[PDB]
Amino acid sequence: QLTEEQIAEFKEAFSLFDKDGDGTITTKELGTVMRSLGQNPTEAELQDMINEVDADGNGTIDFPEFLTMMARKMKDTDSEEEIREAFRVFDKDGNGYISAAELRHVMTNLGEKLTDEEVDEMIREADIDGDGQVNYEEFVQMMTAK
């Protein structure tokens, strides 16, 4: 399942954070890399970043902790992209709003024999701003609901 070339990418990414080589990524190193790429965070934001993955509670990120951090960012971006792709499927015109017609068309294309009242309901239940259309934000809110 896992390949040596994969482990090599993992290791190199870790060292690009752990520039000193002590085996741990501190908030200082973590901050500096974000800094060198534009975006500027605060040490509170940094500490929250370390905190989400600090399994041992030692205030730093060791290798397996960086592996988890990595897997979570990947999964987060995979879901965020599946949602963007679905939205672009429904918003047939690219105007950023899903109309009742667009939902009607896509659904019968997918095979779903929905009545007009069924698509007006889908639209109404995801419409927050109440404009009769579903924008991207409302689309995401529905897609990731519990």
């Binding site: 070339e5 090599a8 990418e9 993992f10 190199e12 990414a13 690009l16 954070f17 890399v33 974000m34 790429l37 975006q39 951090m69 990595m70 960012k73 990947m74 971006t77």
Partner: peptide, 24 residues
């Protein structure tokens, strides 16, 4: 130029993409 090293360049690009994904 030697696929044991030019492969290394490919892995450098891979690690860089990973560090961008964590910064973002």
């Amino acid at each position: 130029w030697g696929q044991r090293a030019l492969q290394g360049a490919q892995a450098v690009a891979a690690a860089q993409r990973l560090v961008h994904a964590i910064a973002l």
